[PDB]
Amino acid sequence: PLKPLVFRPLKLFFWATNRHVHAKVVRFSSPFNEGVPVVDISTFDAFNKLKGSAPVVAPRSLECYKEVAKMVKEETARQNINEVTLHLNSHASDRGVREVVRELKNLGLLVKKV
Amino acid sequence: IEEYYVVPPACPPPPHNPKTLKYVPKLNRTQIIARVYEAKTPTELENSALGKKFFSEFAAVAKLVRLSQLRRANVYNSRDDAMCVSIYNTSVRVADKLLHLSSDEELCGLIWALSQLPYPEYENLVDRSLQILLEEDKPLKTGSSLAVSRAAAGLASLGRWDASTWEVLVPLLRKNVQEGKEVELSNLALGLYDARETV
Amino acid sequence: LVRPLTKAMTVVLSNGATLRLPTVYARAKPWFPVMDLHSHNVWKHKIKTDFQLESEKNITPDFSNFYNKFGK
Amino acid sequence: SSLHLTSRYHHMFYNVLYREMMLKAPKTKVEQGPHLESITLTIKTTDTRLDKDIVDKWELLLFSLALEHITGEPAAFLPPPNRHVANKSAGVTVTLKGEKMFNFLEKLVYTILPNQTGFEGVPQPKTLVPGPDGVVKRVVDFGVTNLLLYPDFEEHFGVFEPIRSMQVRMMIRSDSDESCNMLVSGLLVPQLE
RNA sequence: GUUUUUACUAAUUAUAAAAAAGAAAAGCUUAACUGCAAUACAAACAAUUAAAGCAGGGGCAUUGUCGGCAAUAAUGCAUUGAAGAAAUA
RNA sequence: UAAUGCGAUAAUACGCAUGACGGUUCAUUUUUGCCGUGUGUGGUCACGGUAAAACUUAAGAAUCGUCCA
RNA sequence: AAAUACAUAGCUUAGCGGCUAAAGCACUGGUUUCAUAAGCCAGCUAUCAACAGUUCGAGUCUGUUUGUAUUUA
RNA sequence: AAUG
Lengths: 114, 199, 72, 193
Ligand SMILES: [Mg+2]
Ligand SMILES: [Mg+2]
Ligand SMILES: [Mg+2]
Ligand SMILES: [Mg+2]
What we know:
This is part of a larger assembly, with chains A, B, C and D. Chain A has three helices and five strands, in the order βββααβαβ. By secondary structure, chain A is of the alpha/beta class. Helices cover 36% and strands 25% of the residues of chain A. In chain A, strand 1 (10-16) and strand 2 form a beta hairpin. Chain A has helices spanning 43-53, 62-78, 95-107, and strands spanning 10-16, 21-27, 36-42, 83-86, 110-112. Helices cover 63% and strands 0% of the residues of chain B. Chain B is elongated. In chain B, helix 1 (29-37) packs parallel to helix 3 (57-73). By secondary structure, chain B is mainly alpha-helical. By secondary structure, chain D is an alpha+beta fold. In chain D, the strands form two sheets. Chain D has a six-stranded antiparallel sheet. In chain D, strands 2-4 form a two-stranded antiparallel ribbon. Classes of the chains: A alpha/beta, B mainly alpha, C alpha+beta, D alpha+beta. Chains C and D meet through strand 1 and strand 2 of C and helix 3 of D. Bound molecules: magnesium ion (MG) (4 copies). Chain B binds four RNA strands through helix 4. The PDB classes it as ribosome. Keywords: rrna, evolution, translation.
């Protein structure tokens, strides 16, 4: 019962590793050509930012997950992006990824699964 | 209804069966040190000494000393910077476990290397090295002025300014300058200490 | 579905040492087990000294134990 | 807070016992050493006054309550033997890990086992079939035939009268059977050999 | 039918289906609808098979899916008879 | 793809750490056989296929073991 | 090789999905009798041709290998 | 209430 594939110009991707969570926004013109990444934010950037001001425990923490969502919201708002579609895979069910997605929805970004 | 398992017996290699027919010569401490220093890139430095047999206390000191020279002399990209960070993190941790086996020259080099490198200092590596060399007999018996010059310069950069240690080094540094040995480092340390005394 | 609260009780051993152990209920008086590890014969170390070894090696028969009942 | 929230055995294993095993049995890697994974407590119908292989759950509530007192965590009914039978079970079980596992072991060894009449040593370990992960595990099994030695079943003697016996299993991960015995000895549990 | 969770990934008469999928558990429900339908598979004909999309009233979500069931079998023309409703005479 | 991977409290701040040896799992179409179609007195014929089945020597990658010659 | 039935303690004979069992003769022990028969009392035979399946569970339902009738060539 |  796999559903047919639907092409979308803007998609959100997550890459969950042992140490960090990476979020990217990529624009596509056709499935046969490479995309162009417009946003590239990971918990590594948030950790370097918060640690200077507010001590955090480690990159994989609730404080950094919310910080990553906030930074993603600013970049999309500046570029006039308000709606994205999430790419679902094994990493999409990670607890860290789910926290970031919840924060993005509350901030105002409309994320669609289908 | 519960089956049980029998672990297969181990396979000991038969005696008088060479492990390899290739020519792999034996390496001593001197050869490893020469190999480590003769490195041009972080990747070569990382692979210059690996394994618990070669990555000993003396190898860790050599890596830190050579890393400082390469960092000062060259500018690196993101990938090479990550390689440099990995080298520093591993070498210090090895030193923190085999510190008691280090020699006088190795400790003097370690202090100098740590001062030059910009990464965060490990737990108390500098303090521990000072304590071992605080007997005041090793610096006096340090025949090689290079070790004394490195130690004096390292502390000056770190701003320790120990009254007892410096008082001992002053006559040694002046003697080295008179003998023309390690003039650059000895002069640099003396100038920095003189500036501190003025301030 | 709800786990019970675990309290602490004082248990006194044969050697006078005390241990705090979990218990569902609360007891004010210390509990004295009939037998403990130290008193039981199974929990005994097998390290023996040279003096003990010499005593075992040199033993002479003594049948007084059997003949005591006849004398009495 | 006048509550038992710590674990004596937990401190002993990691801060005292672990180093001694390393010296006795050197290994290349730190984590390569004996480890105690879990302890399982089971009560079946054959260990109770009830004489039937399959019994209703309401008849096993008392035994489930008994395990809760002993362990401090709720127990669960065993799965039915077949889909046809739904409301009948065949015993109760409970599994413990971590601090709760160590606390149970300490109380059992120090107080209950020494007061059991016919105890000499725990049997030798048995090696199970490796699972999909390929890890070899050994199990040590023994039973407690006098459950009325705990000081907890005295509040309501009539209620807990039918409690008779229980079975215990311990799972150990180690390189060889000798290592398993070394760990068991460190736990102060004599082994029958 | 549809949402949520995860130490699970089976079974059918038979079968290498299926991981953004299923099974089980928990909650709410009746789309197992009314009136139509481009275009195709197959096929002597009769019938048989798949189906985007439009309007109405609904279900669960909150903008996706639902016109019965993983799929491949569980059936019978016309006539005659009978029932519910509606329009005539 | 070192912002990697793995872990026996398994969580990730801490532990192992990218080299070197050893054992496993993955080019003249390697060139022979074989198969298919066409033609055929049953083969002194032609072309193609084998990422369907047998068959060569490497080089690399992924684990795993290891105080290292 | 075709077709329809049947293989149940020592022998006749219940049973044809909830556990693996009914009734009569035989056999064993006791009682009655001078003794033997009849009559009376209590017991005993894991009670289910052989193999492979279906089902939570089969003497019971489905196939195969054996034996016995009945009809046909 | 058959038999020896
Ligand atoms: Mg037609
Ligand atoms: Mg809708
Ligand atoms: Mg459907
Ligand atoms: Mg006669």
